[PDB]
Amino acid sequence: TNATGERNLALIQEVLEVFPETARKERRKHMMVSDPKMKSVGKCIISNRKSQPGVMTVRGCAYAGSKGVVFGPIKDMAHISHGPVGCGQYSRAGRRNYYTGVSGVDSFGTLNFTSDFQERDIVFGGDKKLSKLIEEMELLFPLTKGITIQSECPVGLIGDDISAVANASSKALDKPVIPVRCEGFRGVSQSLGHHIANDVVRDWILNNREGQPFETTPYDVAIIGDYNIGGDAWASRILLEEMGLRVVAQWSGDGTLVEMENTPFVKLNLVHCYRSMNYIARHMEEKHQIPWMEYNFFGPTKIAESLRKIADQFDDTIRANAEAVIARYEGQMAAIIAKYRPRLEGRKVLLYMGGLRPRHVIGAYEDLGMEIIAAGYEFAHNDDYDRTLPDLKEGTLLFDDASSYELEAFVKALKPDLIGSGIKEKYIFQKMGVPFRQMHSWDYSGPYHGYDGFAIFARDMDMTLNNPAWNELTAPWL
């Protein structure tokens, strides 16, 4: 490796010295330094394994991955947090998966529905309560298109059968009632909740309109795996429509049960978050012969590449449209770069997020002349680390499921100029004097996808990196 790689391998050995031997040996296989000639990680790193007990992992659970990430955003369905009261309260309106609608009336994403388990529900079981709950929900919320039941830890442990309840209630209501066995003890992170949710969508939603008429167009697509954080999916959809495509469905930011049911009628599936929804994209290719491709709408280099590749799946008319869209926004892009690149170039960034963004936002940073010196994921799999390798400079630190201890030690040694990570990391690193941007919630800003999003991204990285308060951490008399 190069001098940077050597310095990072020596940092890995020093950071892991504190760990008891059993953990130390395990944790060593979750970090590496990148090689630009490598196309696959192979046995160079392992991921999607249990977390080490007691280390302050950043990860969540399978209920977060199913309720919080995949189903929670669908606006026209009521999602029941089934179990005790905690899980639904902590996850109520924490994720900015934007939608439009009339809250509590035709759209339900900011309400927290729950069966608030009490001790008698644990002793006697919750299925009778769940059935009665759904009756009461249909009375008070008549305009739901369908209902989901997101299981929390106790449900499977006490032996409840929510599938029998879902079948009985769906017949009585005459609407889809979808049971999900996403208890938080299953799997090792948010990831298994994604996969559970894709399999539930496959069996309980996606075949509901089979053999029904649907008026198609040659240029019908679906956005697969964009949860509209801060309006990200709207800022992407506008470009696809400007290029001449019809976006029939968006999964699942601002999404509906109806759009998801019409998705087997499209011509092409456009996957943005590979981690969370590659499973259903591969299923639709096998079963419905719909091709699918990965794309990236962060910053102008990736957006131009994606628009051209998407258009190349169609005909010369959409290929011409892709060029016209890029030329229409070229002025806007060159003005953003000319204003903000000079304020940001040469600065070094450390990134730590879930399953996509740690590699996906690198091109936007490079478009503003910034350099990524370390990138890690909470719950990514080895096919995601494979996908990260082309976008890393030689010797970069690439890591998986870091503890708080490890991220703090990496930051103290690497001295990034800027960190992008989550809410449990933000206030630690600001007190250490490092400019920090939340790269899950966008620090209450965004969108960051698309051309309109790149301007906001650039404004925000400049705002925080160059803020005057960063020169005041040390009192002037010290």
Binding site: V85, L140, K424
Partner: protein, 519 residues
């Protein structure tokens, strides 16, 4: 589109013509209910007919106003020096506890899990407990690891005490580290029950073998319970110093939730020391400041420490602060400080100066049981009418006490108290009972929005007092107890009334005959 000169975030970006057009076009692919039908159901959700149906619910909860036990054990644990909170069970719970407090305090929150998975469902979680204590000790070097549980651990019946005894026996946790524990099932009670259960665990670990003697130390202990205003821990210490009465708070997270941004991260800072907890049985007494939730803590004080557990009301408002200072003075034999009498008279001056804008105002309010009892008492003392009073996690014994208090006040004649009801119940009550204002936490913003959509005349503005406060910054610094906290509540209430009246009278040429300069 964007311009370089004025970049717009999400709002108001999406107000632009091209996005309104996008939305109209996307609407056509959703099989949306027509706007007339959505209007009709919205209106019907504001009615008394819908309210009756809403109050027939026995299984569905919507927009709860409580959290689960281990959140409160985590907060109690953070108030002890060099203590790492540790929740035995599944890790998703700890990501959510940390996040929930991160967003209220705008601060880091240390807490670990031992990451029990499906493997631990049949074997039990004793391997996770052994490795978890071992790894947390090595990485974080705590003096105390304070262990609570998640619901998976409670359902499977993990024998917490035995697991920890095995970890000690087998060398996974060193003898220098204290490991107090408590069972904290999320399907019993709420976050306030978790706090009390954790406090009992600390009491057993640090004092069970001690032979105490009340009054050997001429001090009072104070126990706050679950409390998320930094100012309340600080005002209690400040008043006790003015009284010249030695004191210790038992669980005081105010330093670790307010560390300076000076280039260093301090996972531990301040807190009740081991010396303070170990010598607690020698104090004169321990005052339990949120009495409805400190139930096991009162049995500690009386049955383990053989202290009086002198009954005190939550020290919210003028009369309840006077009663706390009279109790401290009687127990200690020291007179109430002249500086405290001066502060009291300044609060009374403020109440007299602002009374014409508060008298007769109607409030809805919700929150934890001890807070709601204290705030209802102070509103009655101001001549306000607390017409809608809701506590999702309060019990029937508290409800009887609240109705006794209300029946004895001229200002409680129209008050209705609701327990085991949620914020979708509270929403209907704002539409049918229409108080002038509602006092609540950030979840109340959606109720204000819903009342405004019926019409400007029906809007019930939110006043933020409680937890969590996520959509305004630095309110967690404030004080709500003592005379200082009462000054903040009176100022907050009268200026909410005056801000709403200016807004109502700010229409040029129409309602601004009463847009008075002086109020």
């Amino acid at each position: 589109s964007q311009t370089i000169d004025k970049i717009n975030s999400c709002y108001p970006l999406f107000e632009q013509d091209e996005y309104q057009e996008l939305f109209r076009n996307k609407r056509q692919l959703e099989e949306a209910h027509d706007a007339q039908r959505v209007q009709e159901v919205f209106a019907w959700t504001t009615t008394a007919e819908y309210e009756a149906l809403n109050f027939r619910r026995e299984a569905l909860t919507v927009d709860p106003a409580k959290a689960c036990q281990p959140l409160g054990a985590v907060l109690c644990s953070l108030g002890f020096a060099n203590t790492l909170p540790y929740v035995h069970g599944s890790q998703g719970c700890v990501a959510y506890f940390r996040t929930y407090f991160n967003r209220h305090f705008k601060e880091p929150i240390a807490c670990v899990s031992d990451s029990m998975t499906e493997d631990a469902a049949v074997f039990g979680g004793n391997n996770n407990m052994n490795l978890g204590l071992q790894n947390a000790s090595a990485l974080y070097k705590p003096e105390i690891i304070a262990v609570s549980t998640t619901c998976m651990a409670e359902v499977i019946g993990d024998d917490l005490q035995a697991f920890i005894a095995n970890a000690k026996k087998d060398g996974f946790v060193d003898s220098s580290i204290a490991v107090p524990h408590a069972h904290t099932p999320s399907f019993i009670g709420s976050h306030v029950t978790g706090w009390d259960n954790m406090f009992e665990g600390f009491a057993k670990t640090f004092t069970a073998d001690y032979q105490g003697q009340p009054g050997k130390l001429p001090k009072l202990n104070l126990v706050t319970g679950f409390e998320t205003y930094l100012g309340n821990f600080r005002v209690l210490k400040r008043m006790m110093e003015q009284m010249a009465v030695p004191c210790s708070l038992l669980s005081d997270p105010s330093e670790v939730l307010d560390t300076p941004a000076d280039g260093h991260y301090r996972m531990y800072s301040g807190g009740t020391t081991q010396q303070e907890m170990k010598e607690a049985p020698d104090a004169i007494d321990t005052l339990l400041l949120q009495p409805w939730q400190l139930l096991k803590s009162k049995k500690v004080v009386q049955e383990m420490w053989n202290q009086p557990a002198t009954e005190v009301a939550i020290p919210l408002g003028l009369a309840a602060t006077d009663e706390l200072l009279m109790t401290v003075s009687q127990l200690s034999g020291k007179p109430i400080a002249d500086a405290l009498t001066l502060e009291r008279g300044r609060l009374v001056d403020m109440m007299l100066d602002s009374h014409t804008w508060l008298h007769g105002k109607k409030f809805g309010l919700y929150g934890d049981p001890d807070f709601v009892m204290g705030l209802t008492r102070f509103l009655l003392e101001l001549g306000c009418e607390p017409t809608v009073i809701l506590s999702h996690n309060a019990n029937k014994r508290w409800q009887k006490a609240m109705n006794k208090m209300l029946d004895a006040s001229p200002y409680g004649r129209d008050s209705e108290v609701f327990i085991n009801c949620d914020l979708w119940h509270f929403r209907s009550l704002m539409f049918t009972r229409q108080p002038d204002f509602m006092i609540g936490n950030s979840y109340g913003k959606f109720i204000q929005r819903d009342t405004l959509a019926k019409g400007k005349a029906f809007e019930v503005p939110l006043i933020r007092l409680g937890f969590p406060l996520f959509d305004r910054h630095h309110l967690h610094r404030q004080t709500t107890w003592g005379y200082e906290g009462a000054m903040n509540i009176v100022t907050t209430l009268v200026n909410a009334v005056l801000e709403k009246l200016d807004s109502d009278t700010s229409q040029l040429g129409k309602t601004d005959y009463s847009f008075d300069l002086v109020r």
